[PDB]
Design a protein around this ligand. Structure first.
Ligand SMILES: CN(C)c1nnc([C@H](N)S(N)(=O)=O)s1
Ligand SMILES: [Zn+2]
Length: 257
């Protein structure tokens, strides 16, 4: 089935998922000179004080940190969004080398990695109904560059040893996602899609301008994960990013001047 290799990677996905060649696919290159400041955008509200993390899982493609989304505990509102979007999970995309790994690019620059905080619109009642709607999801994207360590990431780094292979999970309670955010909430926004199969066109993307810094030792621990299952020959989990897709009939808006 699908993956990131030569025989099952992004250039093959359209045969099972024809929407791969659709009109609102993600990620995209963000041309900073072309993006325009939008005064109609409302301030942006990240409310993560009552977040309840539960578990961390290796799915064969990336790892997910999952949250209790049975009540409004950790929500995203404001900015381009109408209504309330509940945090369900976060994950990353990363490279084999420090000069590649992000999905979005900025003036064609690739970062070492990209964090995705995935949220669903509570007017649709559950995540599976939300992904069938054009405004069903909001994904907050944050770039990672290599330099100083991120103290708030270290708890994630230290549990990766326990989920090395596809299908493994571990308890991950009391993790505070506020420790993964940069100082500034300045952002770019556009309508797009999931970046993995089934590639559904259901996402409002909100991509922060300020990257977070992580250390070379933190990213090296991501690159020790495996795509394969336990007992199978080793295929390092690296380069699990989709490249930039055609912008087509879309405008990227900026929250800042
Ligand atoms: C469960 N669903 C559909 C998804 N889980 N992670 C997904 C992606 N990896 S992204 N990048 O958020 O579209 S898509
Ligand atoms: Zn993602």
């Amino acid at each position: 089935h699908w993956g990131y290799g030569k025989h099952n990677g992004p250039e093959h996905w359209h045969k099972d998922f024809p929407i791969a060649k659709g009109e609102r696919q993600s990620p995209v290159d963000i041309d900073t000179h072309t993006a325009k400041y939008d005064p109609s955008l409302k301030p942006l509200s990240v409310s993560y004080d009552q977040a309840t993390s539960l578990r961390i899982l290796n799915n064969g493609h990336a790892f997910n940190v999952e949250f209790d989304d049975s009540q409004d505990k950790a929500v995203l509102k404001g900015g381009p969004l109408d209504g309330t979007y509940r945090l369900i999970q976060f994950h990353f995309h990363w490279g084999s080398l420090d000069g590649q790994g992000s999905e979005h690019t900025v003036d064609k620059k690739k970062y070492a990695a990209e964090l995705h905080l995935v949220h669903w619109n509570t007017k649709y009642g559950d995540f599976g109904k939300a992904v069938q709607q054009p405004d069903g999801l909001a994904v907050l994207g944050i770039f990672l560059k290599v330099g100083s360590a991120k103290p708030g990431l270290q708890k994630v780094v230290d549990v990766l040893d326990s989920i090395k292979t596809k299908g493994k999970s571990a308890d991950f309670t009391n993790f505070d996602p506020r420790g993964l955010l940069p100082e500034s909430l300045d952002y770019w926004t556009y309508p797009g899609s999931l970046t993995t199969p089934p590639l559904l066109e259901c996402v409002t993307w909100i991509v922060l301008k300020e990257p977070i810094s992580v250390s070379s030792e933190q990213v090296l621990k991501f690159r020790k994960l495996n795509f394969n299952g336990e007992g199978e020959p080793e295929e390092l989990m690296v380069d699990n990013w989709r490249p930039a897709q055609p912008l087509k009939n879309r405008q990227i808006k900026a929250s800042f001047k």
